[PDB]
Amino acid sequence: NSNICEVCNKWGRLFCCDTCPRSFHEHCHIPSVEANKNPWSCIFCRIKTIQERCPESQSGHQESEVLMRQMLPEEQLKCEFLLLKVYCDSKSCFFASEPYYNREGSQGPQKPMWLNKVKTSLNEQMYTRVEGFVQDMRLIFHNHKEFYREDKFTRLGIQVQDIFEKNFRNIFAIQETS
Ligand SMILES: [Zn+2]
Ligand SMILES: [Zn+2]
Ligand SMILES: [Zn+2]
């Protein structure tokens, strides 16, 4: 197994996958690494199994149909993995914890949002459809773009949103378009 966490790229107290060489901090994995379970298979492995059980699940889908899906176990897992892919980027640090807003010439968002809030929301099964999860994720970056206006820091929102959107299209097998 790897000797650094797959998500944050640091060493520490690492839990190792039994079916692939990845390793994780306990609360870096999503869901948090399960207490017992020998063997244990990481989220990457669990997602690959879904694909292998239903190869047709990789055919192209329309975003509008994906968003309306109910959060059954497989869609719950897919959203957890998509959230984890965002945390994998080091620029996620900016969006993880609860923001505050005091900048001359800007007003804070009406509905603040952050990664750890989305994480808790998934853990507590608060989303009933994929749309709920995707809306909150996109809100994180939209709030940032609006608040930072012409400051070059707005680019961090564009960057992390791009990571989100690329991984959304991959994980949910969105139909490729020009
Ligand atoms: Zn970690
Ligand atoms: Zn694995
Ligand atoms: Zn099948």
CA of 111 to the centre of ligand 1 (A): 29
CA of 9 to the centre of ligand 1 (A): 6
The answer for residues whose C-beta is within 8 angstroms of residue 94's C-beta and 6 or more apart is 144, 156, 160
Q: In whole angstroms, what is the distance from residue 40 CA to residue 71 CA?
A: 23
Does CATH number 3.40.50.720 belong to domain 1-59? no
Q: Could you tell me the residue ranges of all domains in the chain?
A: 1-59, 60-178
Question: Are 78 and 67 in contact, with CB atoms under 8 Å apart?
Answer: no
Q: Which of 59, 26, 60, 24 is nearest to 45 (CA)?
A: 24
Please report which ligand is nearest the Cα atom of 58: 3
Q: What are phi and psi of 174, to 5 degrees?
A: -70, 135
Q: Which experimental approach was used here? A: X-ray
Q: In whole angstroms, what is the distance from residue 27 CA to residue 16 CA?
A: 13
Assigned fold of 60-178 = Histone Acetyltransferase; Chain A (1.20.920)
Please report which ligand is nearest the Cα atom of 57: 3
Dihedral sign, CA of 23, 137, 90, 110?
A: negative
CA of 1 to the centre of ligand 2 (A): 10
What does this entry list as its resolution, in Å? 1.6
Question: Are 106 and 148 in contact, with CB atoms under 8 Å apart?
Answer: yes
CA of 58 to the centre of ligand 3 (A): 11
Q: In whole angstroms, what is the distance from residue 114 CA to residue 94 CA?
A: 9
Please report which ligand is nearest the Cα atom of 88: 1
